[PDB]
Design an enzyme around this catalytic site. Structure first.
Site, PDB file in Angstrom:
ATOM      1  N   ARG A   1       0.864  -1.187   0.000  1.00 47.49           N
ATOM      2  CA  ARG A   1       0.000   0.000   0.000  1.00 47.49           C
ATOM      3  C   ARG A   1       0.901   1.238   0.000  1.00 47.49           C
ATOM      4  O   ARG A   1       2.112   1.107   0.116  1.00 47.49           O
ATOM      5  CB  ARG A   1      -1.061   0.047   1.106  1.00 47.49           C
ATOM      6  CG  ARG A   1      -2.470  -0.338   0.555  1.00 47.49           C
ATOM      7  CD  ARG A   1      -3.601   0.462   1.219  1.00 47.49           C
ATOM      8  NE  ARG A   1      -3.601   1.854   0.756  1.00 47.49           N
ATOM      9  CZ  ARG A   1      -4.054   2.888   1.460  1.00 47.49           C
ATOM     10  NH1 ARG A   1      -4.551   2.706   2.689  1.00 47.49           N
ATOM     11  NH2 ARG A   1      -4.001   4.105   0.933  1.00 47.49           N
TER      12      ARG A   1
ATOM     13  N   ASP B   1      -2.198  -0.043   9.311  1.00 42.89           N
ATOM     14  CA  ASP B   1      -1.165   0.838   8.792  1.00 42.89           C
ATOM     15  C   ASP B   1       0.262   0.708   9.299  1.00 42.89           C
ATOM     16  O   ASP B   1       1.200   0.865   8.537  1.00 42.89           O
ATOM     17  CB  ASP B   1      -1.569   2.281   9.034  1.00 42.89           C
ATOM     18  CG  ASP B   1      -2.856   2.651   8.345  1.00 42.89           C
ATOM     19  OD1 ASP B   1      -2.875   2.817   7.094  1.00 42.89           O
ATOM     20  OD2 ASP B   1      -3.849   2.794   9.082  1.00 42.89           O
TER      21      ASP B   1
ATOM     22  N   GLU C   1      -0.870  16.988   5.278  1.00 42.58           N
ATOM     23  CA  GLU C   1      -0.603  15.562   5.360  1.00 42.58           C
ATOM     24  C   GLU C   1      -0.204  15.105   3.967  1.00 42.58           C
ATOM     25  O   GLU C   1      -0.620  15.719   2.986  1.00 42.58           O
ATOM     26  CB  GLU C   1      -1.861  14.769   5.733  1.00 42.58           C
ATOM     27  CG  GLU C   1      -2.513  15.087   7.064  1.00 42.58           C
ATOM     28  CD  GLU C   1      -1.811  14.483   8.269  1.00 42.58           C
ATOM     29  OE1 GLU C   1      -0.708  13.916   8.132  1.00 42.58           O
ATOM     30  OE2 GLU C   1      -2.389  14.532   9.368  1.00 42.58           O
ATOM     31  N   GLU C   2       0.674  14.103   3.892  1.00 43.34           N
ATOM     32  CA  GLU C   2       1.069  13.455   2.633  1.00 43.34           C
ATOM     33  C   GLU C   2       1.220  14.346   1.415  1.00 43.34           C
ATOM     34  O   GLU C   2       0.482  14.213   0.442  1.00 43.34           O
ATOM     35  CB  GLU C   2       0.041  12.331   2.344  1.00 43.34           C
ATOM     36  CG  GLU C   2      -0.212  11.467   3.578  1.00 43.34           C
ATOM     37  CD  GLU C   2      -1.395  10.537   3.451  1.00 43.34           C
ATOM     38  OE1 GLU C   2      -2.413  10.918   2.866  1.00 43.34           O
ATOM     39  OE2 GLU C   2      -1.330   9.423   3.984  1.00 43.34           O
TER      40      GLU C   2
ATOM     41  N   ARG D   1      -2.747  17.236   1.718  1.00 45.02           N
ATOM     42  CA  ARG D   1      -4.048  16.823   2.182  1.00 45.02           C
ATOM     43  C   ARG D   1      -4.369  17.385   3.560  1.00 45.02           C
ATOM     44  O   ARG D   1      -3.634  17.158   4.527  1.00 45.02           O
ATOM     45  CB  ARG D   1      -4.097  15.286   2.214  1.00 45.02           C
ATOM     46  CG  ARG D   1      -5.156  14.666   3.106  1.00 45.02           C
ATOM     47  CD  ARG D   1      -4.818  13.207   3.316  1.00 45.02           C
ATOM     48  NE  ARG D   1      -5.664  12.508   4.264  1.00 45.02           N
ATOM     49  CZ  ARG D   1      -5.710  11.178   4.373  1.00 45.02           C
ATOM     50  NH1 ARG D   1      -4.956  10.400   3.599  1.00 45.02           N
ATOM     51  NH2 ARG D   1      -6.502  10.612   5.276  1.00 45.02           N
TER      52      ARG D   1
ATOM     53  N   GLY E   1     -10.563  20.686   5.376  1.00 44.12           N
ATOM     54  CA  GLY E   1     -10.639  21.077   3.988  1.00 44.12           C
ATOM     55  C   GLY E   1     -10.895  20.021   2.945  1.00 44.12           C
ATOM     56  O   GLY E   1     -10.412  18.878   3.064  1.00 44.12           O
TER      57      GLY E   1
ATOM     58  N   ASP F   1     -10.387  16.680  -2.761  1.00 42.30           N
ATOM     59  CA  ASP F   1     -10.165  15.708  -1.699  1.00 42.30           C
ATOM     60  C   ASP F   1     -11.307  14.682  -1.754  1.00 42.30           C
ATOM     61  O   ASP F   1     -12.182  14.755  -2.630  1.00 42.30           O
ATOM     62  CB  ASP F   1     -10.050  16.340  -0.309  1.00 42.30           C
ATOM     63  CG  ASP F   1      -9.110  15.556   0.598  1.00 42.30           C
ATOM     64  OD1 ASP F   1      -8.821  14.392   0.283  1.00 42.30           O
ATOM     65  OD2 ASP F   1      -8.644  16.079   1.617  1.00 42.30           O
TER      66      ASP F   1
ATOM     67  N   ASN G   1     -10.979  13.420   7.394  1.00 42.98           N
ATOM     68  CA  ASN G   1     -10.782  12.397   6.407  1.00 42.98           C
ATOM     69  C   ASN G   1     -10.249  13.023   5.138  1.00 42.98           C
ATOM     70  O   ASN G   1     -10.235  14.261   4.982  1.00 42.98           O
ATOM     71  CB  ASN G   1     -12.078  11.671   6.126  1.00 42.98           C
ATOM     72  CG  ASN G   1     -11.848  10.229   5.730  1.00 42.98           C
ATOM     73  OD1 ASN G   1     -10.696   9.779   5.572  1.00 42.98           O
ATOM     74  ND2 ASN G   1     -12.947   9.488   5.539  1.00 42.98           N
TER      75      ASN G   1
ATOM     76  N   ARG H   1     -13.269   6.221  -2.394  1.00 45.82           N
ATOM     77  CA  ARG H   1     -12.066   6.234  -3.241  1.00 45.82           C
ATOM     78  C   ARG H   1     -12.429   5.350  -4.404  1.00 45.82           C
ATOM     79  O   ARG H   1     -12.013   4.201  -4.507  1.00 45.82           O
ATOM     80  CB  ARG H   1     -10.895   5.645  -2.466  1.00 45.82           C
ATOM     81  CG  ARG H   1     -10.569   6.441  -1.222  1.00 45.82           C
ATOM     82  CD  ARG H   1      -9.525   5.780  -0.370  1.00 45.82           C
ATOM     83  NE  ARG H   1      -9.085   6.736   0.646  1.00 45.82           N
ATOM     84  CZ  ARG H   1      -8.181   6.473   1.587  1.00 45.82           C
ATOM     85  NH1 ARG H   1      -7.616   5.274   1.665  1.00 45.82           N
ATOM     86  NH2 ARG H   1      -7.852   7.416   2.446  1.00 45.82           N
TER      87      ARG H   1
ATOM     88  N   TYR I   1      -4.755   6.347  -3.249  1.00 44.80           N
ATOM     89  CA  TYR I   1      -3.758   7.405  -3.287  1.00 44.80           C
ATOM     90  C   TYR I   1      -3.279   7.733  -4.709  1.00 44.80           C
ATOM     91  O   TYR I   1      -3.442   6.946  -5.647  1.00 44.80           O
ATOM     92  CB  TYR I   1      -2.570   7.015  -2.396  1.00 44.80           C
ATOM     93  CG  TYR I   1      -2.812   7.194  -0.902  1.00 44.80           C
ATOM     94  CD1 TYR I   1      -4.106   7.359  -0.386  1.00 44.80           C
ATOM     95  CD2 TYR I   1      -1.735   7.253   0.001  1.00 44.80           C
ATOM     96  CE1 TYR I   1      -4.325   7.589   1.006  1.00 44.80           C
ATOM     97  CE2 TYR I   1      -1.935   7.486   1.389  1.00 44.80           C
ATOM     98  CZ  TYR I   1      -3.236   7.656   1.873  1.00 44.80           C
ATOM     99  OH  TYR I   1      -3.421   7.936   3.207  1.00 44.80           O
TER     100      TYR I   1
HETATM  101  C1  LIG Z   1      -3.948  11.776   7.573  1.00 41.66           C
HETATM  102  C2  LIG Z   1      -2.947  10.849   6.934  1.00 41.66           C
HETATM  103  C3  LIG Z   1      -1.942   9.957   7.751  1.00 41.66           C
HETATM  104  N1  LIG Z   1      -2.741   9.106   8.624  1.00 41.66           N
HETATM  105  C4  LIG Z   1      -3.169   9.434  10.008  1.00 41.66           C
HETATM  106  C5  LIG Z   1      -2.166   8.968  11.051  1.00 41.66           C
HETATM  107  C6  LIG Z   1      -2.684   9.445  12.378  1.00 41.66           C
HETATM  108  C7  LIG Z   1      -3.707   8.765  13.012  1.00 41.66           C
HETATM  109  C8  LIG Z   1      -4.164   9.172  14.256  1.00 41.66           C
HETATM  110  C9  LIG Z   1      -3.600  10.274  14.872  1.00 41.66           C
HETATM  111  C10 LIG Z   1      -2.578  10.974  14.253  1.00 41.66           C
HETATM  112  C11 LIG Z   1      -2.124  10.556  13.010  1.00 41.66           C
HETATM  113  C12 LIG Z   1      -3.238   7.956   8.143  1.00 41.66           C
HETATM  114  O1  LIG Z   1      -3.931   7.211   8.829  1.00 41.66           O
HETATM  115  C13 LIG Z   1      -2.991   7.426   6.735  1.00 41.66           C
HETATM  116  O2  LIG Z   1      -4.193   6.936   6.279  1.00 41.66           O
HETATM  117  C14 LIG Z   1      -4.279   6.104   5.217  1.00 41.66           C
HETATM  118  C15 LIG Z   1      -5.419   6.141   4.425  1.00 41.66           C
HETATM  119  O3  LIG Z   1      -5.597   5.277   3.540  1.00 41.66           O
HETATM  120  O4  LIG Z   1      -6.189   7.107   4.584  1.00 41.66           O
HETATM  121  C16 LIG Z   1      -3.200   5.295   5.007  1.00 41.66           C
HETATM  122  C17 LIG Z   1      -1.860   5.662   5.602  1.00 41.66           C
HETATM  123  N2  LIG Z   1      -1.180   4.450   5.803  1.00 41.66           N
HETATM  124  C18 LIG Z   1      -1.998   6.299   6.899  1.00 41.66           C
HETATM  125  N3  LIG Z   1      -0.743   6.812   7.480  1.00 41.66           N
HETATM  126  C19 LIG Z   1      -0.164   6.380   8.601  1.00 41.66           C
HETATM  127  C20 LIG Z   1       1.102   6.906   9.169  1.00 41.66           C
HETATM  128  O5  LIG Z   1      -0.664   5.532   9.314  1.00 41.66           O
HETATM  129 CA   LIG Z   2     -10.045  16.552   3.877  1.00 40.20          CA
END
Ligand SMILES: CCCN(CCc1ccccc1)C(=O)[C@@H]1OC(C(=O)O)=C[C@H](N)[C@H]1NC(C)=O
Ligand SMILES: [Ca+2]
Ligand SMILES: *[C@@H]1O[C@H](CO)[C@@H](O[C@@H]2O[C@H](CO)[C@@H](O[C@@H]3O[C@H](CO)[C@@H](O)[C@H](O[C@H]4O[C@H](CO)[C@@H](O)[C@H](O)[C@@H]4O[C@H]4O[C@H](CO)[C@@H](O)[C@H](O)[C@@H]4O[C@H]4O[C@H](CO)[C@@H](O)[C@H](O)[C@@H]4O)[C@@H]3O)[C@H](O)[C@H]2NC(C)=O)[C@H](O)[C@H]1NC(C)=O
Ligand SMILES: *[C@@H]1O[C@H](CO)[C@@H](O[C@@H]2O[C@H](CO)[C@@H](O[C@@H]3O[C@H](CO)[C@@H](O)[C@H](O[C@H]4O[C@H](CO)[C@@H](O)[C@H](O)[C@@H]4O[C@H]4O[C@H](CO)[C@@H](O)[C@H](O)[C@@H]4O[C@H]4O[C@H](CO)[C@@H](O)[C@H](O)[C@@H]4O)[C@@H]3O)[C@H](O)[C@H]2NC(C)=O)[C@H](O)[C@H]1NC(C)=O
Ligand SMILES: *[C@@H]1O[C@H](CO)[C@@H](O[C@@H]2O[C@H](CO)[C@@H](O[C@@H]3O[C@H](CO)[C@@H](O)[C@H](O[C@H]4O[C@H](CO)[C@@H](O)[C@H](O)[C@@H]4O[C@H]4O[C@H](CO)[C@@H](O)[C@H](O)[C@@H]4O[C@H]4O[C@H](CO)[C@@H](O)[C@H](O)[C@@H]4O)[C@@H]3O)[C@H](O)[C@H]2NC(C)=O)[C@H](O)[C@H]1NC(C)=O
Ligand SMILES: *[C@@H]1O[C@H](CO)[C@@H](O[C@@H]2O[C@H](CO)[C@@H](O[C@@H]3O[C@H](CO)[C@@H](O)[C@H](O[C@H]4O[C@H](CO)[C@@H](O)[C@H](O)[C@@H]4O[C@H]4O[C@H](CO)[C@@H](O)[C@H](O)[C@@H]4O[C@H]4O[C@H](CO)[C@@H](O)[C@H](O)[C@@H]4O)[C@@H]3O)[C@H](O)[C@H]2NC(C)=O)[C@H](O)[C@H]1NC(C)=O
Ligand SMILES: CCCN(CCc1ccccc1)C(=O)[C@@H]1OC(C(=O)O)=C[C@H](N)[C@H]1NC(C)=O
Ligand SMILES: CCCN(CCc1ccccc1)C(=O)[C@@H]1OC(C(=O)O)=C[C@H](N)[C@H]1NC(C)=O
Ligand SMILES: CCCN(CCc1ccccc1)C(=O)[C@@H]1OC(C(=O)O)=C[C@H](N)[C@H]1NC(C)=O
Ligand SMILES: *[C@@H]1O[C@H](CO)[C@@H](O)[C@H](O)[C@H]1NC(C)=O
Ligand SMILES: *[C@@H]1O[C@H](CO)[C@@H](O)[C@H](O)[C@H]1NC(C)=O
Ligand SMILES: *[C@@H]1O[C@H](CO)[C@@H](O)[C@H](O)[C@H]1NC(C)=O
Ligand SMILES: *[C@@H]1O[C@H](CO)[C@@H](O)[C@H](O)[C@H]1NC(C)=O
Ligand SMILES: *[C@@H]1O[C@H](CO)[C@@H](O)[C@H](O)[C@H]1NC(C)=O
Ligand SMILES: *[C@@H]1O[C@H](CO)[C@@H](O)[C@H](O)[C@H]1NC(C)=O
Ligand SMILES: [Ca+2]
Ligand SMILES: [Ca+2]
Ligand SMILES: [Ca+2]
Lengths: 388, 388, 388, 388
Positions: free
Chosen positions: C37, C70, C196-197, C212, C217, C244, C266, C290, C324
């Site tokens: 992924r 994740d 983010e990302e 993101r 937003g 988004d 989200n 998605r 993604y």
């Molecule tokens: C917003 C994107 C990154 N985050 C949030 C991480 C987070 C969670 C809870 C508290 C703080 C931070 C995601 O969950 C991403 O989501 C997704 C996703 O498909 O939305 C996959 C990514 N594998 C994941 N990243 C990480 C590091 O786990």
């Molecule tokens: Ca958003």
């Protein structure tokens, strides 16, 4: 860079140490390993590789059924990294055929594969991975060659072929190639009566091949080749220590220019290092089947008709299967002398182990040591019941 | 290019960061992964690789049955790309044997494999991928070596071997090789009473090895080698923080020149970085089994017989299996100092997990950071029930 | 040779042509393919490769159960040849972690992997395949990065990280690395409320990242970075064409410096090419999941708050899954301008397809053409019922 | 180094020797082999490789169901080492598409893949492994190309495309590329009425392509191209020895500028070497299906409307399946002349063998010999019952 020349003599062989072993059948029980037979080892200036004739199927694959057959359109000469098994993914095809030889002359490698029907076979010589020369069958009865590496000297690489009967007089020729082209060819000379699957090595500008008299001899024929004069001669190993298989029991006195009678129309590819007192013969332990394998130091075996062993080393115990064996040396290793080496084909499956429908092998190879190393036996290691 | 020289000192080790992990058993549940044990890591000037002794079968293959056994003719030293699993197709065989060591001297790599029966074993030293020297057993009782990388300085690579009893006085020798040839060898000197599987590293022209006293010590023996003078000395780590396994509970004061008594005839290959205040010891968390793994900063452990930890980092939780561990460093990395590294073998299968009939492992390796990084535990990750 | 400099501008994008596609899930149904992924594509001066975070198991393997998670100790950044699937045997591990970025600066590649517990994660920067720098978590809540390539200019490669809440204000920093060392770091500036990302690309000595806003937003934040001055600024894409997911329906007028409200907490990693009239946005077709993927030419989207599409191209139909998407370019291709490219992750398995217990993906990537090419849809192609 | 120029003429073709054979279906019965069709062979200055359009699934994989279909988003041009099977792990993807051609100009390789819906397909030309030029469909009805290698001369590589009806007049164009850019394109000239899948080779600065008139001709159209003047002309092979399939029985006199009537709307990609008396045609043995394969020496076939065979060689017996066949030559082999070569696609599965649900193939390739070698037949070798 430049053509390799056989400028050194052999190192003193006081024992043999383990060089490479692929454990192909153990591993192939659960991996994509190709069914093979007639393997050998051959070096380039920068790497030594395992070679063999693939059957064009994996061991576990359904097409493995019937791989006891020698000639078909699905065989090919393949090479792969030393001590790895011949797998579908790491194997390089050298040429298409059911009989072969190959050697590096110092600049590049020449590989020769023979294919065809029994009465219309042909050899195609590849040099630097391109087809260059082709030779058609001359006796119309299974044109065949060494099944182990050839040797070159200053660009010239002699190769021994045999065409005709496997159990009578046949037409054997020595071709002298240079960059894939035929410089000349000779009919067999000397006293050898039949020649098959020669195992060769070179030292001090001379090439020695120990072959197989499939017709009547239990002592092995030898062909000494002069790659500069492009001439040769032949005889039999004089020693009473018989090295073909099947064979009679050793007598007290052997023969120098005639086959030692006893078993007819059969044998096994084998080799020897003939170097005065520094002489070692390889042979199956069993006189009846391709079973066990040992190396025996027999001083002056080539010429002394009463020579007997003064030392030895067991390679494979007589309870384990063996098969073909041949010589090779890394002519590009650092050092003052050439280190003698050899491989033993460990055949599993048909005809001896009839519970499975296939025939394949693994390889064990050793090289000489000037030390007197302790010995160990090196069997194939696979458990046939796991394949049922 | 030129022979590597140990010109730097160690970097300050304030924590450990994740370097490589192969997840071999998780992946091997459904891929052609070789069964291994006794792994280590070793770098060349341009690449760092994972090494281990293969058992000559895949994990899912039927021949995996019985791989709890240490010595057989089906083992071989193999290397493969960092963090990849040891698969049948991406693995390079270095030599054939059931005990090994290997190191790059800056120009090329020397690999040593030992094979044979318990009473007639022999070591064959390979240099630049060719056999060069052979040493026969001197005490006739399992000639064995490091099981982790050796280290070189200006062409000279010392290697520690032990021949004889695993539970009594034995004959340990330090050989000094240069380009595969023996320059000299010494009998063990100093106060160490027994030596097995030394883990070494080098800095500022000196080589330090932390070994294993399988006979009576729970504190570890250390061998300091001078690769220029070709001399050495030995003692035990003074600290009360005991690092062998199985072992007694830590006392308040340790011993510098005698084994700390408590457990007899057992242990585990381990290592340490001994650098004054910059000293870190590795050990299993469990005092009873090879379970868990932690790194402890113990200032002056080598010489201070009352030294206790001032910092630490858990690598594997005590609920997860560990096993052998050793040192290595990328002596060719850019930088002002050498970054200390280590690997932990994560053993799965027999003897602890008896539901399966095999024994294999995966690897986790870390390197030091001058930062104070947060910690995480790094277990094998495979679920044994998936293999039943 | 020398550090790459962003000296060109983008080519005119009149349509998109197929660049690479791996068909990983179709093939993985009966091959040793790794579960992955968060993939992306990244080029070196002589080759472009596919990248992704492995789950440390094959798809058909029993450990594939649970790969919806994740972060774990079994993930690693891997790279493999363009259009090949990520198999166990052709995959190279770059570093160990569950979040990453990677880019070639012209001389060599820098790869960054983050691993650890949620409250004690750390990033380790690798350069020329060796660990060089390590950064510990600053907000103690999942230190994370881009999940697509970074970009360099004259040795300097900025990277965007975020540490803290995924659904509130967090601490985002832009680090400027040169040869793996930190030259400087900034806190996020401008009007972007959450980052983010980030998906980045560079042209005419400037780096643009479309990220993101996972908090509030539905329009995407943009970070423009100046790699020479080592400064940056941020805002949102002005256009009413929301990119988004999940998101509200497009309005008639968008917002330039505030999140467009509608969906909270989200989103999905996405990208855009912002180049005046030569502007193209990518987005899922579905506003709810998605699902589907299209590219829309929206002249001056960055600054015109009423900009609407003037052309478009469907990449994946709304009946097929997407995921993604990010940007990359071959900065080393011959030519007068940089050809814009992008990839789309085609997620299969959980959560949408709950009949299987795994989550994995394949990749499709396209590059721009100055021609107006006909379009085709590029779905994953695997039939889930074949995995039951 | 420098652009290759067609400076030699063909060698005398007195017979054909075995060059390469992959045994793909035999091996694929128990290995991860990709389903393919439309294969060919093509050389670079240092290596010759097998090429084919993958179906994006293995043979044993469940997605193999349905691979009788020609166009989908899961096909890709792949290349792999000579005589190896196209496996998932040793295959390199050249581009994404369902129709292709590829050739090395001496400096680097140009590969062209066409993809898309039937009415909106597009070709993307890759040079040195990067997309360079894109051509959109001009007749909106399956833009398609050679399915075998193109040929270059001094940088210029002509390629024949056809867009439009497969069973009526269509729009065929000859594009002249140099380093991936279009130098010029021509509409088809001469008397050929329909052109499909041209098989080309070059000698003495001229390029000859033998194509397929899918509309009404059973004799084959020929396109002679002048790569310096960038012009061409077309006609049909005059000989009564008909080489398309299906076809009527041979008459006593053929046609030079008109299709020989008999079978409509069907054919098979084939080739020929047209060199005065040194002329050899290839054809299926069966006039009804793609069954058997033979080479016939037909002196002056191109121009003599009553020419009949004076020699021949059977390649595949009429009881075995054949399929597409095309030409290629190693333009970089040492020597005074170019050695003519060809490959035959051995199709297995649907439509003829309906017990399986897939369609795939293996390859056999031969090259000319100036010797009169004995012949052998080279069938696929797989046993379909093993796949049920
Ligand atoms: C917003 C994107 C990154 N985050 C949030 C991480 C987070 C969670 C809870 C508290 C703080 C931070 C995601 O969950 C991403 O989501 C997704 C996703 O498909 O939305 C996959 C990514 N594998 C994941 N990243 C990480 C590091 O786990
Ligand atoms: Ca958003
Ligand atoms: C640690 O390692 C070291 C190093 O390896 C060990 O020392 C070595 O030990 C070897 C085994 O004893 C020893 O080999 C032997 O050497 C003698 C000469 O000294 C040699 O004669 C032996 O060979 C004969 O014996 C074996 C069976 O033992 C036969 O298989 C072999 O063919 C030889 O005998 C046959 O042929 C002879 C000649 O014709 C006949 O005279 C004899 O009767 C026999 O013939 C029959 O059998 C034949 C074979 O089937 C058949 O064809 C024929 O028709 C007859 O039926 C053997 O090579 C090494 O020399 C020695 N090496 C060194 C340096 O010392 C040591 O044991 C190990 N340490 C420990 C603790 O084990
Ligand atoms: C984010 O990450 C950071 C960085 O990692 C975290 O901070 C770190 O936290 C570590 C864990 O607390 C901390 O390690 C500890 O450091 C102290 C010294 O300060 C050290 O003493 C600890 O080691 C002892 O404790 C562990 C168990 O906790 C034992 O397994 C270990 O062996 C040590 O104790 C044993 O030996 C001692 C010496 O002989 C005895 O005195 C003691 O009783 C004990 O002996 C028994 O157990 C032995 C082992 O089984 C056995 O052999 C013996 O016989 C006895 O039975 C430990 O290393 C780091 O120093 C700290 N690092 C930093 C920079 O701060 C932080 O928690 C993370 N953040 C969050 C939110 O979690
Ligand atoms: C051969 O190939 C050629 C080249 O590809 C083909 O020609 C191309 O054909 C394309 C398809 O028609 C064409 O794309 C379209 O271009 C127009 C502008 O000209 C563009 O507006 C289209 O985009 C809208 O439509 C699609 C659905 O058709 C939507 O999915 C897309 O999001 C756009 O609409 C949405 O957003 C708009 C702006 O906000 C809204 O106004 C609109 O109502 C709609 O909003 C709803 O849906 C959204 C998406 O779900 C949602 O978020 C929102 O909330 C609302 O619910 C589309 O891109 C190419 O321009 C054209 N290219 C060329 C060079 O001509 C040709 O057909 C092929 N030949 C054959 C025989 O087929
Ligand atoms: C060792 O190897 C050597 C070297 O290979 C062997 O010698 C070679 O042996 C070959 C086989 O005999 C020989 O080939 C033949 O050569 C003659 C010319 O000399 C040639 O005419 C033959 O071709 C016709 O025959 C085959 C069937 O035998 C047909 O399949 C082929 O198409 C040719 O006939 C068809 O077309 C002709 C022209 O139009 C018609 O006149 C004829 O009637 C026939 O037409 C029907 O069948 C067609 C095909 O289905 C169909 O389309 C049409 O409508 C009609 O229905 C063949 O090529 C080599 O020349 C020879 N080579 C050398 C150097 O000598 C030797 O046997 C081997 N040694 C041993 C012991 O076996
Ligand atoms: C004598 C050694 C070569 N021959 C005889 C070939 C022959 C048979 C009948 C008549 C003439 C010649 C062999 O059978 C070899 O035997 C053996 C064998 O294990 O003995 C395997 C070789 N694969 C095979 N060689 C070939 C080419 O088939
Ligand atoms: C003490 C460490 C080496 N020894 C003892 C060898 C020995 C046994 C009996 C008598 C003498 C010597 C070991 O058993 C090691 O143990 C272990 C182990 O996990 O403890 C694995 C090693 N594979 C093995 N080494 C060898 C060569 O077999
Ligand atoms: C005539 C040869 C090319 N065509 C016709 C394409 C076409 C169909 C209908 C209308 C117009 C064009 C073929 O079908 C070829 O046939 C065959 C075949 O085995 O005959 C396989 C090729 N995979 C296929 N080519 C393509 C592009 O699909
Ligand atoms: C072999 O000898 C020839 C001359 O007889 C010489 O030209 C060649 O370089 C020699 N080979 C090597 C490797 O020195
Ligand atoms: C190591 O030191 C020796 C001389 O002591 C020198 O010749 C060699 O080049 C040095 N190695 C390097 C890598 O500089
Ligand atoms: C990039 O620019 C720097 C100077 O600003 C220069 O030294 C370097 O060579 C340039 N890179 C290339 C690839 O020209
Ligand atoms: C996957 O795991 C869950 C929870 O660990 C279990 O209930 C489920 O049945 C597993 N699925 C399969 C196919 O094993
Ligand atoms: C091909 O010919 C051109 C000039 O016409 C020349 O520049 C080039 O080097 C030639 N190619 C070779 C391989 O000699
Ligand atoms: C292949 O697919 C068809 C139609 O999609 C189906 O009826 C058939 O049974 C499938 N064959 C197999 C072996 O699954
Ligand atoms: Ca005989
Ligand atoms: Ca102990
Ligand atoms: Ca036709």
């Amino acid at each position: 860079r430049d053509f390799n020349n056989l400028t050194k003599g052999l190192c003193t062989i006081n024992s043999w140490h383990i060089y490479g072993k692929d454990n192909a059948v153990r591993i192939g029980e659960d991996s994509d390993v190709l069914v093979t037979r007639e393997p050998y080892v051959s070096c380039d200036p920068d790497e030594c590789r395992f070679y063999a004739l693939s059957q064009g199927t994996t061991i576990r694959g359904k097409h493995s059924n019937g791989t006891i057959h020698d000639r078909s359109q699905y065989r090919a000469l393949i090479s792969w990294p030393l001590s790895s098994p011949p797998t579908v993914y790491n194997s390089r095809v050298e040429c298409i055929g059911w009989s072969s030889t190959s050697c590096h002359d110092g600049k590049t490698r020449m590989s020769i594969c023979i294919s065809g029907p029994n009465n219309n076979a042909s050899a195609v010589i590849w040099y630097n991975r391109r087809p260059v020369t082709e030779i058609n069958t001359w006796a119309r009865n299974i044109l065949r060659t060494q099944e182990s590496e050839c040797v070159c000297h200053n660009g010239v690489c002699p190769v021994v072929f045999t065409d005709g009967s496997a159990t009578g007089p046949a037409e054997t020729r020595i071709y002298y190639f240079k960059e894939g082209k035929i410089l000349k060819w000779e009919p067999l000379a000397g006293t050898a009566k039949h020649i098959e699957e020669c195992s060769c090595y070179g030292e001090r500008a001379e090439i020695t091949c120990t072959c197989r008299d499939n017709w009547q001899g239990s002592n092995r024929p030898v062909i000494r080749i002069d790659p500069v004069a492009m001439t040769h001669t032949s005889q039999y190993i004089c020693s009473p220590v018989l090295t073909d298989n099947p064979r009679p029991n050793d007598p007290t006195v052997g023969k120098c220019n005639d086959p030692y009678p006893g078993n007819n129309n059969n044998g096994v590819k084998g080799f020897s290092y003939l170097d005065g007192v520094n002489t070692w013969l390889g042979r199956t332990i069993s006189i009846a089947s391709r079973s066990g394998y040992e190396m025996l130091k027999v001083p002056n075996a080539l010429t002394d008709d009463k020579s007997k062993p003064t030392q030895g080393q067991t390679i494979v115990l007589n309870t384990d299967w063996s098969g073909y064996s041949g010589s090779f040396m890394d002519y590009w290793a650092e050092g003052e002398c050439y280190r003698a080496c050899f491989y033993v084909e460990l055949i599993r499956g048909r005809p001896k182990e009839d519970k499975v429908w296939w025939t394949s092998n693994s390889i064990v190879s050793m090289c000489s040591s000037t030390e007197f190393l302790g010995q160990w036996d090196w069997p194939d290691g696979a458990k046939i019941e796991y394949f049922l």
